[PDB]
């Protein structure tokens, strides 16, 4: 056996040598060199120094530039908020713990951090999903006489919140659980311990099916159609140089978006399904943190992709940062 189990945790290292300590009570320098904890920190620091300004600037610029304030932009605001939760609930906490070498805030800290950290990543996720439903809806016009507006934009955000609660909340109250992962400095869902008094199994399938497969299907279908509709319309207006250009652009973007959504969750889900099929073969603390690296670094690239890459917002950003105009 490659792990050593505690009542609130699973350190992925073997206590045959008796050196394993609780991830809530003492440094874990036996499962990773302290220089590696330093890099854990360097990484969290990078995520903050980029993530905060990128996601903050986004809210701030909307507050200043009124054309950015469409109902169809609401969900992108939602995205930046959720990215911020990821920063202040997850990244900073981890910065602080990595530098101690273990999770210095104990079980409740574990829950708090784990909750807000997954709440964020999940709102962000379903934001990307809602965005597509919305875009599809307004472009493919799947409804007789329908005009997307504020009320819709809203329900959409609320939906984003209800999904994420249906994901982060249950561990707190009996279904699955939160525990330190990988190097034990940050806390997340436990998808690698047949912990029965909590049904970690039914939950991971639930998580897999409802919070990965579905989102992935919905996204692909919506953007799939949207690209169809657009290429179908263009083909019918080949005399319009601009339209052909808009068509090219839209496609390139959908591709970038889908590839991005994959690069961010596939890894997490690949590891999960693997483990679920490969019962508790020692998974390096380091290895456990690869599904996590990809997902977390999204809080910087999502905003770059879905916001920074829009001639409009981009224009405002300039004005704002440049003391008024330019």
Ligand X SMILES: *[C@@H]1O[C@H](CO)[C@@H](O[C@@H]2O[C@H](CO)[C@@H](O)[C@H](O)[C@H]2NC(C)=O)[C@H](O)[C@H]1NC(C)=O
Ligand Y SMILES: *C(=O)CCCCCCCCCCCCCCC
Ligand Z SMILES: *[C@@H]1O[C@H](CO)[C@@H](O[C@@H]2O[C@H](CO)[C@@H](O[C@@H]3O[C@H](CO)[C@@H](O)[C@H](O[C@@H]4O[C@H](CO)[C@@H](O)[C@H](O)[C@@H]4O)[C@@H]3O)[C@H](O)[C@H]2NC(C)=O)[C@H](O)[C@H]1NC(C)=O
Ligand U SMILES: CCCCCCCCO[C@@H]1[C@@H](O)[C@H](O)[C@@H](CO)O[C@H]1O
Residue 3 binding ligand X, by CB under 6 A? yes
Q: What does DSSP assign to residue 286?
A: H
The residue within the footprint of ligand U, chosen from 5, 19, 25, 33 (CB under 6 A), is 33
Residue 277 binding ligand X, by CB under 6 A? no
The residue within the footprint of a second copy, chosen from 49, 162, 217, 233 (CB under 8 A), is 49
Helix%, strand%, coil% for the chain, nearest 5: 70, 5, 25
Among a second copy, ligand X, ligand U, none, the one that 249 touches (CB under a kind-dependent 5 to 8 A) is a second copy
| Distance, CA of 161 to CA of 153 (rounded, Å) | 13
Structural contact between residues 121 and 51, judged by C-beta atoms closer than 8 angstroms? no
- The HSE-up count of residue 201 (CA atoms within 13 Å, CB side) is 8
Q: Is 201 annotated as a binding residue?
A: yes
Q: Which two tokens stand for residue 291?
A: 């599904």
Structural contact between residues 202 and 196, judged by C-beta atoms closer than 8 angstroms? no
Residue 314 binding a second copy, by CB under 8 A? no
**C-alpha distances in angstroms, 15 versus 9, 21, 83, 288?**
14, 9, 37, 19
The residue within the footprint of ligand Z, chosen from 3, 10, 12, 22 (CB under 6 A), is 22
CB of 13 to ligand X, least distance (A): 11
Residue 20 binding ligand Z, by CB under 6 A? yes
| Distance, CA of 184 to CA of 139 (rounded, Å) | 46
Q: Please, what is the angle between helix 106-140 and helix 150-172, to 10°?
A: 150
Residue 324 binding ligand Z, by CB under 6 A? no
Q: Convert residues 84-113 into a mask of x (bound to a second copy by CB under 8 A) and - (unbound).
A: --------------xxx-------------
DSSP β-ladder status, 9-11 and 4-6: antiparallel
DSSP β-ladder status, 9-11 and 187-189: unpaired
Residue 41 binding a second copy, by CB under 8 A? yes
CB of 96 to ligand U, least distance (A): 5
The stretch among 58-66, 75-83, 114-122, 216-224 that binds ligand U (CB under 6 A) is: 216-224
- Is residue 11 helix, strand or coil? strand
CB of 100 to ligand Y, least distance (A): 23
Among ligand Z, a second copy, ligand Y, none, the one that 38 touches (CB under a kind-dependent 5 to 8 A) is a second copy
Q: Is 36 annotated as a binding residue?
A: no
Interacting residues with a second copy between 246 and 305 (CB under 8 A): 249, 252
Residue 4 binding ligand Z, by CB under 6 A? yes
- The HSE-up count of residue 30 (CA atoms within 13 Å, CB side) is 17
Q: Convert residues 236-275 into a mask of x (bound to ligand U by CB under 6 A) and - (unbound).
A: ---------------x--xx--x-----------------
Q: Which residues contact 109 (CB under 8 A, 6 or more apart)?
A: 103, 187
Q: Which is nearer to a second copy, 46 or 155 (CB)?
A: 46
- Enumerate the known binding-site residues for Zn(2+): 201, 279
Residues that bind ligand Z (CB under 6 A): 4, 6, 15, 18, 20-22
């Amino acid at each position: 056996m490659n792990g050593t189990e505690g009542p609130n945790f699973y350190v992925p290292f073997s206590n045959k040598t008796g050196v394993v300590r609780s991830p809530f009570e003492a440094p874990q320098y036996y499962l990773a060199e302290p220089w590696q904890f330093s890099m854990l920190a360097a990484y969290m620091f990078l995520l903050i120094m980029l993530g905060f300004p990128i996601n903050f600037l986004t809210l701030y610029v909307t507050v200043q530039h009124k054309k950015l304030r469409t109902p169809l932009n609401y969900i992108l605001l939602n995205l930046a908020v959720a990215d911020l939760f990821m920063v202040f609930g997850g990244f900073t906490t981890t910065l602080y713990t990595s530098l101690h070498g273990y999770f210095v805030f104990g079980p409740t800290g574990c829950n708090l951090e784990g909750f807000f950290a997954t709440l964020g990543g999940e709102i962000a996720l379903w934001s990307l999903v809602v965005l597509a439903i919305e875009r599809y809806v307004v472009v493919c016009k799947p409804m007789s006489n329908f005009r997307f507006g504020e009320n819709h934009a809203i329900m959409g955000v609320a939906f984003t919140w209800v999904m994420a609660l249906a994901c982060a909340a249950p561990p707190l109250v009996g279904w699955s659980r939160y525990i330190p992962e990988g190097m034990q400095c940050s806390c997340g869902i436990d998808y690698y311990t047949p912990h029965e008094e909590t049904n970690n199994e039914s939950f991971v399938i639930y998580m897999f099916v409802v919070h990965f497969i579905i989102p992935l299907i919905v996204i692909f279908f919506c953007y799939g159609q949207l690209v169809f509709t657009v290429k179908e319309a263009a083909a019918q207006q080949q005399e319009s140089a601009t339209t052909q250009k808009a068509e090219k652009e839209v496609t390139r973007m959908v591709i970038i978006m889908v590839i991005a959504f994959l690069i961010c969750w596939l890894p997490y889900a690949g590891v999960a399904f693997y483990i679920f099929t490969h019962q508790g073969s020692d998974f390096g603390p380091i290895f456990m943190t690869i599904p996590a690296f990809f997902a977390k670094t999204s809080a910087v690239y999502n905003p770059v992709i879905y916001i920074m890459m829009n001639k409009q917002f981009r224009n405002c950003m300039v004005t704002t940062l440049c003391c008024g105009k330019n």
